Amino acid sequence: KTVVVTTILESPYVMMKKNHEMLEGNERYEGYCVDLAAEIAKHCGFKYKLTIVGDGKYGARDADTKIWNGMVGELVYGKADIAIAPLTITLVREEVIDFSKPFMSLGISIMIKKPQKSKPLTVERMVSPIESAEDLSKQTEIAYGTLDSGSTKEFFRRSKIAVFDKMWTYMRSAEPSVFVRTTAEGVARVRKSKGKYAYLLESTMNEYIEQRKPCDTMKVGGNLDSKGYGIATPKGSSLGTPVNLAVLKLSEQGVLDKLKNKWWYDKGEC
Amino acid sequence: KTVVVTTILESPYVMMKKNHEMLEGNERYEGYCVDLAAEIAKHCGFKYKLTIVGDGKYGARDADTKIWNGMVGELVYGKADIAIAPLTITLVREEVIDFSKPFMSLGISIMIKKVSPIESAEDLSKQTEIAYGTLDSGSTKEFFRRSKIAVFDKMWTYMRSAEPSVFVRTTAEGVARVRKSKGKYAYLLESTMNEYIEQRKPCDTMKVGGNLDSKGYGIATPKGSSLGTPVNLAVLKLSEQGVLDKLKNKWWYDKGECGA
Amino acid sequence: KTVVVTTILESPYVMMKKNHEMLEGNERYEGYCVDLAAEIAKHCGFKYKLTIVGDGKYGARDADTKIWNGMVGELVYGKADIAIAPLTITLVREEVIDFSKPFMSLGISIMIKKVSPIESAEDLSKQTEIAYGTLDSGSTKEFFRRSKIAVFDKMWTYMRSAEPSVFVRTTAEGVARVRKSKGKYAYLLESTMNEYIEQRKPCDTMKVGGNLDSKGYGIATPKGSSLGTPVNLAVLKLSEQGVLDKLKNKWWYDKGECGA
Amino acid sequence: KTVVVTTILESPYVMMKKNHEMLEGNERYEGYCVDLAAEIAKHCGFKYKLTIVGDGKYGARDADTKIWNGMVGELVYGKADIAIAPLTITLVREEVIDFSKPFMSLGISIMIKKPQKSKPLTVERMVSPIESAEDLSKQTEIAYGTLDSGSTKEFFRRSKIAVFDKMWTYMRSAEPSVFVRTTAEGVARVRKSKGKYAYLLESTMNEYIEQRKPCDTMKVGGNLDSKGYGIATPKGSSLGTPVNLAVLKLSEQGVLDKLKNKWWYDKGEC
Ligand SMILES: NS(=O)(=O)c1cc2c(cc1Cl)N[C@H]([C@H]1C[C@H]3C=C[C@@H]1C3)NS2(=O)=O
Ligand SMILES: NS(=O)(=O)c1cc2c(cc1Cl)N[C@H]([C@H]1C[C@H]3C=C[C@@H]1C3)NS2(=O)=O
Ligand SMILES: NS(=O)(=O)c1cc2c(cc1Cl)N[C@H]([C@H]1C[C@H]3C=C[C@@H]1C3)NS2(=O)=O
Ligand SMILES: NS(=O)(=O)c1cc2c(cc1Cl)N[C@H]([C@H]1C[C@H]3C=C[C@@H]1C3)NS2(=O)=O
Ligand SMILES: N[C@@H](CCC(=O)O)C(=O)O
Ligand SMILES: N[C@@H](CCC(=O)O)C(=O)O
Ligand SMILES: N[C@@H](CCC(=O)O)C(=O)O
Ligand SMILES: N[C@@H](CCC(=O)O)C(=O)O
């Protein structure tokens, strides 16, 4: 029996190959997550089929409707067996699905358009109007937002820290809406907003986008928190312990480090 | 029913208080792990008693004996109910005990005395002038022993065949040996311990290069115990509430007895 | 019995003089390989005739047909008696023809137009901005095809799946493509050819990095022929007498039509 | 049946391990040649034993008696089957034994004691009294010699080049004898002669000795010629073709390059 591996289209985790029109099956996709699935299969023998989540969402719970959407919803309602995707381990998600040990460490970072070089002996220096989350919250000329139906938005919603609470209070009543539907949409907003929009995304995606052309964006400050990506399985499933053991084996063998190096830094430019 | 909490004396995780002679119970202990244990107990809602492991070892399996020692042995053999200590999450340990989600990130680092010719670990393995060792009965030693990476294979080949014994009994003794080696001995240890040592007086040791790999400390529970899910949710809630970051800042950088 | 010698038009190995239209026989050819063939004939004591291979290919076997072309094909199928030419000694060729001892050392080198950002082979593979190719039906292409090293595997994967065809038909064609690419294309060729090109006008190309590997040119002879031992002894005698070094200096640095 | 592999005690080709007193068999020795023999065995399956030539000589054709000695001699007379050792491919040797493709390139170089750095804005410069071979031949205040019963001595003996002929003419009638019995003896002579002795050895050994402590010797100029080391085998033997094919396989596979890098440059003490 073949199990369903749900995932989301997000570079560099899951990207379509250039010649993907003539290919079929799992060979159309490429990235970190497809290699992770291949290594998981190598550890524990099973047949898997790569599928993309229908709504293109990571997962969230509506307050009034109380139905999980995205990959978490797909896993909860039995439409998938395992989610090998950049899914953030959160307390609310852990109560409805099973998470393995983290395979990648990350944190919430800020993305802004890279400032032009300041000419004024004849040294060149780069100065950005945002240096930390606190000054980003204090100012009001640059709008900021997160990804809709994501872990960062829920983190800001349920944060009792004064700075993060202030940012959330600004976000919930910002006209026009500062929330985006996709990471690429947020990066496009940052690029075309001429320095008047800051995107709050994970540090891994931020660094990856900064490492590729045209590299007109930069990451400012440090990470707002420390989290991780976990492989998710439904509650009471027989694939949880083998997946956790496989992740631990890959971590000890150094496969994860080599995968990160070959998918993030060996493919950068500029 | 009071829950026995095994732990090890390792700064800044667990320390003996200055007036611990005139104190009883858990009130004679201080550190990151003490506050973490207090918050875990508050979240779960149980009474706990802090106990120090009889042998100052984290845990390992002896060859041709298959007997666990340290806090891992204290857990597999029913002598303890939970282990709130800087216990590295490893593949070998996870097959006998239940680990929660990591609460602190870390990695293997190199500590030398205060140009830094050694720099990275590859250059350290490329030079026989400087000796390097690890802590015995620890995750770093097992990581080096089982490593299939070529560089780490050469490092393990050196350590296993070296006279005198390049391994050390305790982390404090290892950093002392580094201090008194006049730049001839290098210590391999956890990144958090290295940072804590290098931020303290006399600040005669420094950390060179990045982390060799990345692991985490987890709260360990006996396999099949009923405390695994509650402590896992407690760790997740503490991480999302910013408590773990504030505790690390309090016990690593708030004091800062050095100029940096 | 006149011995048919097959060779390829490559500089400075074989050239068609300047007034070849008014010359017949071997007198219309010049170069390192012509002098080497003259020395080999003088040592062994046989009359020889220089012929140019019909197709300007060094030699390879095509998949699903198992037919050799070029000088290797000229030797395996009995069309030639000996091959004095810059023929790289390779494992696949050695199983079908007899190679003598190498008479010239060489290696695979990278060249671009006139500090180079490309630097070594690893950085060249990493930077997708610059395209790199290889001569068709040569030993470099087969070296990259059969290579199991990861970096060379990436290079070969790029070359096979490249649009337009990153390969070239002749060495001069690749030289011209590098010259007219304005620093966008890099050529992968032999070290000796690279040095000869870079030491000639207009001196717009330079060799970067070191040598990817180390190989040698050998005098090829049909398998199980009576000429193998005499030509091997002749090559050894020429090497010990310093004739090969003298010829290389004459044809590589004596002229030197460049600013260096 | 197990064949006999004859070797020479030369570093870093064949070296004894520190704990070689309690070891037996092929595990006693270490170096480049033992790994070469192991790879040859892996390519073509056979059982081999490592022996050291009795007289400790590479091989030379003794005049008058016309009897070969050393590794070449013991290969000719049947007491050895294959010589995996730094044996130079020469015309005289090729006529009595078989030689494979060269597995390592080399040349004749000059070894002199490293001079002290010159005191003279405040830059420090290194100046040596010998820069090439012809100036070494011209002067007479510095003695120089080669290895007895070696390939370099034979090369100088039959060389018709004017400068090499002049060096040979000086060498044959030099008292006390400038020739040494072992490479280590010549290096000791260079070190203890306080700049009044130059040792002519192969470039590989010269570089290896340069890279190790106390590194008080240096190589001046360039190689006098271009040669190579071959895997010798008796004339009309069945092991010549498999040995040649294995050498080609190792060269194309990159094994030889990594072996040479690990033995010569990885263990650099200076
Ligand atoms: N450098 S990285 O982000 O690619 C990365 C991050 C991590 C890795 C491995 C790598 Cl390569 N393994 C750890 C795992 C190992 C054991 C301890 C924590 C989990 C279980 N999680 S992690 O700390 O999130
Ligand atoms: N900054 S730190 O080292 O004290 C640190 C490190 C980590 C924290 C929290 C903190 Cl404060 N939480 C994560 C946990 C949270 C959820 C996602 C990964 C695990 C489960 N583990 S971690 O990445 O090892
Ligand atoms: N200096 S050079 O490249 O023209 C050159 C290169 C080489 C020469 C001679 C010269 Cl002049 N001879 C050797 C041969 C001689 C004997 C030892 C190795 C082979 C057999 N091959 S080589 O190392 O490929
Ligand atoms: N760089 S090195 O001296 O260790 C070295 C030197 C040589 C190598 C391989 C290496 Cl790694 N292979 C060549 C061989 C390969 C094929 C072409 C010439 C011989 C047959 N001989 S070589 O040119 O003498
Ligand atoms: N990785 C997040 C989504 C990305 C983001 O919110 O920035 C998740 O799994 O929910
Ligand atoms: N904290 C580690 C020990 C430190 C070390 O490996 O030196 C463990 O629990 O195994
Ligand atoms: N001279 C080489 C061809 C050069 C190349 O590989 O580009 C040969 O004989 O195969
Ligand atoms: N390699 C040489 C010996 C060393 C030398 O003469 O310098 C030989 O095989 O004879």
Residue that the structure tokens 């671009």 belong to: C112
> Hey, how many other C-beta atoms are within 10 angstroms of the C-beta on B200?
16
Nearest chain D alpha carbon to B122? D266
Query: What is the pairing mode between strands D104-106 and D3-7?
Result: unpaired
List the single best residue of C125, C126, C155, C161 to mutate versus A (max A Cβ within 10 A). C126
Instruction: Pick out the residues of the known binding site of B.
Output: 86, 88, 93, 139-140, 190
Question: Residue A266 and residue C129: Cβ atoms within 8 Å?
Answer: no
For residue D179, the number of C-alpha atoms closer than 13 Å in the C-beta half-sphere is: 18
Q: Which of A230, A236, A237 is nearest to A3 (CA)?
A: A237
> Hey, how many other C-beta atoms are within 10 angstroms of the C-beta on C37?
24
Say whether C86 counts as a known binding-site residue. Answer: yes
- Give the span between the Cα atoms of B135 and B174, in whole angstroms: 7
In a shared domain, residues D53 and D14: yes
Any domain includes A270: no
Q: Is the sign of the CA dihedral C119, C120, C126, C130 positive or negative?
A: positive
In a shared domain, residues A125 and A206: yes
* Residue A81 CB contacts under 8 Å (≥ 6 apart), including other chains: A3, A4, A5, A75, A233, A234, A237, A239
Any domain includes B117: yes
Helices (H), strands (E): how many in chain D?
10, 15
CA of C108 to the centre of ligand 8 (A): 29
Any domain includes D98: yes
> Hey, how many other C-beta atoms are within 10 angstroms of the C-beta on C105?
17
Contact A210, A217 (CB under 8 A): yes
- Give the span between the Cα atoms of B57 and B83, in whole angstroms: 13
Ligand closest to B244 (CA) is 2
Q: Assign residue B134 the CATH number of its domain.
A: 3.40.190.10
Q: Is D213 on the interface with B (CB under 8 A)?
A: no
Token pair listed for B229: 């899910």
- Give the span between the Cα atoms of B214 and A13, in whole angstroms: 20
- Give the span between the Cα atoms of B5 and B81, in whole angstroms: 6
Which residues are registered as beta bridge partners of C15? C30
Q: Which of B230, B192, B189, B218 is nearest to B90 (CA)?
A: B218
Residue closest via CA to ligand 3's atom 5 equals C104
The SS3 call for residue A145 is: strand
Residue that the structure tokens 């600040």 belong to: B203
> Which chain B positions have a beta carbon within 8 Å of D267's beta carbon?
128
Any domain includes D44: yes
As for how many domains chain B has, the answer is 2
- The approach used to solve this structure was cryo-EM
Any domain includes B225: yes
Question: Residue D269 and residue B129: Cβ atoms within 8 Å?
Answer: yes
Q: Which of A55, A73, A33 is nearest to A234 (CA)?
A: A73
Contact D12, D208 (CB under 8 A): yes
CA of A150 to the centre of ligand 5 (A): 5
Nearest chain C alpha carbon to D90? C236
CA C244 to chain centre: 16
To what resolution in angstroms was this structure determined?
Answer: 2.8
D152 within ligand 8 shell (Cβ under 6 A): yes
In a shared domain, residues C93 and C220: yes
Q: What residues make up the domain containing A241?
A: 2-105+228-265
Nearest chain D alpha carbon to C238? D91
Nearest chain C alpha carbon to D156? C240
In a shared domain, residues A117 and A101: no
In a shared domain, residues B96 and B13: yes
Instruction: Give me the phi and psi of A208, to 5 degrees please.
Output: -60, -45
In a shared domain, residues D16 and D71: yes
Contact A126, A118 (CB under 8 A): yes
DSSP state of A180: B
> Which chain D positions have a beta carbon within 8 Å of B160's beta carbon?
none
In a shared domain, residues C56 and C119: no
Any domain includes B132: yes
C133 within ligand 7 shell (Cβ under 6 A): no
In a shared domain, residues A154 and A169: yes
In a shared domain, residues D94 and D130: no
B228-240 and B243-252 helices cross at what angle (nearest 10)?
Answer: 80
Q: Is the peptide bond before A176 cis (omega within 30 degrees of 0)?
A: yes
Token pair listed for B88: 């590295």
- Give the span between the Cα atoms of A129 and A218, in whole angstroms: 12
Atom of ligand 3 nearest to the CA of C217: 24
DSSP letters, D70-126, are: HHHHHHHTTS-SEE-S--B--HHHHTTEEE---SEEE-EEEEEEPPPPB------B-
In a shared domain, residues D175 and D240: no
CA of A137 to the centre of ligand 4 (A): 65
Any domain includes C257: no
Say whether D12 counts as a known binding-site residue. Answer: no
- Give the span between the Cα atoms of A88 and A231, in whole angstroms: 9
In a shared domain, residues B96 and B16: yes
The SS3 call for residue D147 is: strand
Which helix (H) or strand (E) segment holds residue A4: the answer is strand A2-7
Q: Is the peptide bond before A12 cis (omega within 30 degrees of 0)?
A: yes
> Which chain D positions have a beta carbon within 8 Å of B126's beta carbon?
266, 268
Nearest chain D alpha carbon to B123? D266
DSSP letters, chain C, are: -PEEEEE---TTTSB-TTTGGG--GGGG-BSHHHHHHHHHHHHHT--EEEEE-SSS----B-TTT--B-HHHHHHHTTS-SEE-S--B--HHHHTTEEE---SEEE-EEEEEE---SS-SHHHHHH-TTSEEEEBTTSHHHHHHHS--SHHHHHHHHHHHT-SS---BSSHHHHHHHHHTTTTSEEEEEEHHHHHHHHTSTT--EEEES--SS-EEE--EEETT-TTHHHHHHHHHHHHHHTHHHHHHHHHHTSS--S--
> Which chain C positions have a beta carbon within 8 Å of D254's beta carbon?
148-149, 213
- Give the span between the Cα atoms of B14 and B8, in whole angstroms: 7
D149 within ligand 8 shell (Cβ under 6 A): no
Q: Where are the beta strands (DSSP E) in chain D?
A: 3-7, 15-16, 29-30, 48-52, 60-62, 67-69, 82-83, 97-99, 104-106, 108-113, 143-145, 197-202, 217-220, 227-229, 232-234
C-alpha separations of D223 from A183, D113, D166, D187 in Å: 61, 17, 18, 18
C-alpha separations of D250 from B182, C214, D35, D243 in Å: 45, 12, 11, 10
- Give the span between the Cα atoms of C154 and C144, in whole angstroms: 9
Any domain includes D269: no
| Greatest alpha-carbon span in chain B | 57
Question: Residue D91 and residue C213: Cβ atoms within 8 Å?
Answer: no
Q: What is the identity of the amino acid at D243?
A: V
Q: How far apart are the CA of D258 and the nearest CA of chain C, in angstroms?
A: 11
> Which chain A positions have a beta carbon within 8 Å of C127's beta carbon?
269
- Give the span between the Cα atoms of B100 and B219, in whole angstroms: 5
In a shared domain, residues A183 and A149: yes
* Residue B16 CB contacts under 8 Å (≥ 6 apart), including other chains: B9, B28, B29, B30
C86 within ligand 7 shell (Cβ under 6 A): yes
Q: Is B148 on the interface with A (CB under 8 A)?
A: yes
- Give the span between the Cα atoms of A128 and A116, in whole angstroms: 9
Q: What is the identity of the amino acid at D78?
A: G
Token pair listed for A27: 């060979």
20-59 in D: which are within 8 Å (CB) of B? none
Which helix (H) or strand (E) segment holds residue A99: the answer is strand A97-99
- Give the span between the Cα atoms of D99 and D85, in whole angstroms: 12
Residue closest via CA to ligand 2's atom 13 equals A227
Contact A5, A81 (CB under 8 A): yes
B243-252 and B191-198 helices cross at what angle (nearest 10)?
Answer: 40
- Give the span between the Cα atoms of B7 and B34, in whole angstroms: 9
- Give the span between the Cα atoms of A78 and A49, in whole angstroms: 15
Q: Which chains touch A (3 or more CB pairs under 8 A)?
A: B, C
| Cβ burial, residue B254 (10 Å; 0-12/13-18/19+) | exposed
